Every structure is written in C-alpha cells, then in structure tokens.
Write a protein that holds these residues in place. Sequence first.
Motif, mmCIF file in Angstrom:
data_model
loop_
_atom_site.group_PDB
_atom_site.id
_atom_site.type_symbol
_atom_site.label_atom_id
_atom_site.label_comp_id
_atom_site.label_asym_id
_atom_site.label_seq_id
_atom_site.Cartn_x
_atom_site.Cartn_y
_atom_site.Cartn_z
ATOM 1 N N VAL A 151 0.822 -1.200 0.000
ATOM 2 C CA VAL A 151 0.000 0.000 0.000
ATOM 3 C C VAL A 151 0.865 1.262 0.000
ATOM 4 C CG1 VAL A 151 -1.976 -1.141 1.039
ATOM 5 C CG2 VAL A 151 -0.239 -0.091 2.493
ATOM 6 N N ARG A 152 2.155 1.122 -0.316
ATOM 7 C CA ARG A 152 3.109 2.224 -0.350
ATOM 8 C C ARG A 152 3.144 2.966 0.980
ATOM 9 N NH1 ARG A 152 4.392 3.560 -6.534
ATOM 10 N NH2 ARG A 152 2.309 3.348 -7.471
ATOM 11 N N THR A 153 2.713 4.226 0.981
ATOM 12 C CA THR A 153 2.657 5.027 2.197
ATOM 13 C C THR A 153 1.243 5.502 2.510
ATOM 14 O OG1 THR A 153 3.230 7.030 0.964
ATOM 15 C CG2 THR A 153 5.041 5.753 1.904
ATOM 16 N N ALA A 154 0.230 4.949 1.841
ATOM 17 C CA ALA A 154 -1.161 5.332 2.056
ATOM 18 C C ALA A 154 -1.678 4.788 3.380
ATOM 19 C CB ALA A 154 -2.036 4.834 0.905
ATOM 20 N N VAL A 155 -1.034 5.163 4.483
ATOM 21 C CA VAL A 155 -1.365 4.643 5.802
ATOM 22 C C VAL A 155 -1.483 5.805 6.777
ATOM 23 C CG1 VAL A 155 -0.537 3.299 7.760
ATOM 24 C CG2 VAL A 155 -0.399 2.362 5.458
ATOM 25 N N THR A 156 -2.554 5.800 7.565
ATOM 26 C CA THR A 156 -2.826 6.827 8.560
ATOM 27 C C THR A 156 -2.990 6.172 9.924
ATOM 28 O OG1 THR A 156 -4.061 7.960 6.811
ATOM 29 C CG2 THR A 156 -4.165 8.897 9.025
ATOM 30 N N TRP A 157 -2.301 6.713 10.924
ATOM 31 C CA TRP A 157 -2.359 6.242 12.301
ATOM 32 C C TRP A 157 -3.212 7.201 13.117
ATOM 33 C CZ3 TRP A 157 -0.992 1.655 14.061
ATOM 34 C CH2 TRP A 157 -0.036 0.911 13.363
ATOM 35 N N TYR A 158 -4.249 6.666 13.770
ATOM 36 C CA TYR A 158 -5.144 7.438 14.617
ATOM 37 C C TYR A 158 -5.083 6.958 16.062
ATOM 38 C CZ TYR A 158 -7.360 8.201 10.031
ATOM 39 O OH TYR A 158 -7.601 8.478 8.707
ATOM 40 N N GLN A 159 -5.351 7.897 16.970
ATOM 41 C CA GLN A 159 -5.580 7.640 18.385
ATOM 42 C C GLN A 159 -7.026 7.981 18.721
ATOM 43 O OE1 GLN A 159 -4.659 10.745 21.764
ATOM 44 N NE2 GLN A 159 -2.987 9.249 21.793
ATOM 45 N N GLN A 160 -7.637 7.189 19.600
ATOM 46 C CA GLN A 160 -9.015 7.413 20.029
ATOM 47 C C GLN A 160 -9.087 7.217 21.537
ATOM 48 O OE1 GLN A 160 -11.983 4.536 18.735
ATOM 49 N NE2 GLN A 160 -13.565 6.129 18.714
ATOM 50 N N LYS A 161 -9.248 8.314 22.271
ATOM 51 C CA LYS A 161 -9.393 8.236 23.713
ATOM 52 C C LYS A 161 -10.784 7.718 24.072
ATOM 53 C CE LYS A 161 -5.997 11.847 24.698
ATOM 54 N NZ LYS A 161 -5.806 13.281 25.055
ATOM 55 N N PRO A 162 -10.935 7.111 25.252
ATOM 56 C CA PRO A 162 -12.212 6.473 25.600
ATOM 57 C C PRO A 162 -13.367 7.463 25.565
ATOM 58 C CG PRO A 162 -10.488 5.805 27.128
ATOM 59 C CD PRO A 162 -9.919 6.920 26.303
ATOM 60 N N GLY A 163 -14.410 7.108 24.817
ATOM 61 C CA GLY A 163 -15.575 7.964 24.710
ATOM 62 C C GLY A 163 -15.379 9.205 23.873
ATOM 63 N N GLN A 164 -14.379 9.219 22.996
ATOM 64 C CA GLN A 164 -14.118 10.346 22.110
ATOM 65 C C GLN A 164 -13.975 9.834 20.680
ATOM 66 O OE1 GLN A 164 -14.537 12.719 24.114
ATOM 67 N NE2 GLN A 164 -13.351 12.468 26.006
ATOM 68 N N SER A 165 -13.807 10.767 19.750
ATOM 69 C CA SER A 165 -13.637 10.442 18.344
ATOM 70 C C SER A 165 -12.171 10.174 18.033
ATOM 71 C CB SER A 165 -14.159 11.586 17.477
ATOM 72 O OG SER A 165 -15.530 11.839 17.736
ATOM 73 N N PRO A 166 -11.883 9.399 16.987
ATOM 74 C CA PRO A 166 -10.486 9.204 16.589
ATOM 75 C C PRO A 166 -9.853 10.521 16.171
ATOM 76 C CG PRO A 166 -11.901 7.547 15.583
ATOM 77 C CD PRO A 166 -12.804 8.583 16.175
ATOM 78 N N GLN A 167 -8.530 10.585 16.291
ATOM 79 C CA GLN A 167 -7.790 11.782 15.923
ATOM 80 C C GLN A 167 -6.477 11.387 15.270
ATOM 81 O OE1 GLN A 167 -7.544 14.701 19.196
ATOM 82 N NE2 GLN A 167 -9.781 14.541 19.331
#
Length: 229
Positions: A151-167
């Motif tokens: 997938v080359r570099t088409a990769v996104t890393w997200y964090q999601q705190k409990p009860g919140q939206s991913p970021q």
Amino acid sequence: EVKLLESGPGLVAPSESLSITCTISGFSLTDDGVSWIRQPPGKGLEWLGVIWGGGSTYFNSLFKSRLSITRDNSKSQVFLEMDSLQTDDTAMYYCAKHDGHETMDYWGQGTSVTVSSGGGGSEIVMTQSPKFMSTSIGDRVNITCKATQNVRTAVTWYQQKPGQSPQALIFLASNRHTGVPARFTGSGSGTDFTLTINNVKSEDLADYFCLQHWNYPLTFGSGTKLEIK
C-alpha cells in the motif's frame, strides 16, 4: 480417557459445502450430546448446534438454513454439514462433548477450515500487533500494522481516547499530523508500518489503529488498547 478428533477438508472454495467428522471415544453417543463450535481468527467462539443423546438436534438461528448435524453410534462419529460457505466461515471448528445435557465438558483438537477462492482475498487486511499493551509511564512502545499488499505510504495512524472520536496521529506512514507531540513517530513503506510512542504520558491511554487508503475499500487495523500501570 475422553477423546474427540475432527476430520475436515482444510480448504474449501466459496459457495461449496463443508463436511466435518467428529470421531469420538471414551463415552457413549446414546448418553452424551455433542456440539459444534467455531472460532474465527481474532473473533469470539460461536456455537453452531448440538445433537443430544436422544437425537434431538438444535441449531444456532444464525445458520439454521444451512446446518445439518447427524451421527452414527456404531462408528462413534458425529457429522457436521454446512451449505453455501463463504469467506466469513473461515474458522477453527471444534466438536465438544457434554455431560449428558448440562455442561460442555471436553473439546476436540479442532480442524482449521480456510475459505478462499484462490485469489487469497480481495479487500486488503491490515493486521495490528499487539492487541493489548500494559505500559509504564515513560516507556517507549511500538505498534505495527501489516498489509496483505504493498500500500506504499497510504497509511494513517489514529488515536481514540475512551468515549471520544479518533484523531489523526500520523499521515502518509511517517508524517506527524498538525499539533501532534513529537514523541509519536511513524515508520514504514510497503507492507509493514510502525507507530512508535516515546515518553509514554498519562493522556496516551487510548486505542490506536492504522488505516490503509491505497485501494477500495478503506480498511482499518483491529486496534490496540494502551493501558498504563
């Protein structure tokens, strides 16, 4: 010694059937019932059905239409038969023996059933490791995500705190999103990718996951929960 051994094909093409044989010993099919359970990779256990000592057959409603459970008491064998198999049915299939009718006592070795047309699958699977992590404040930890295709570099890393939206933490494999602390870093190109957290702080307690956006459909990693001691 109570024994149950499954005998199954191992490879089945989509839309075909599935016939597994539970060869039992050490107990009597006239007395004890035998259930069929399956375990998809990374999923929970799923009960399919049961044949009781008297022959009563009950099935899980989710299958019902395509399941059949028979036996042969002389041969000491119990047979499972499933119709219209698809990729979702890829799982380790067990037969288990009850104490007559109450508690499911003894499991078999299990037989691994893989369903693929021969094209290996088509959607691109992002496999994350590890699923769980208990960390101390100040450690450095890695989360990796592996793609079944370049997938080359088409990769996104997200964090999601409990009860919140991913970021968004990392975008295009290795670049920090705007306003991201410099302790989060991204590595990788091709198939393997690595989110690294240096100097684990208390607010880092969240759920992290990868996402590929090379080809449709967009697919996420199974996730990774970060606990702090």
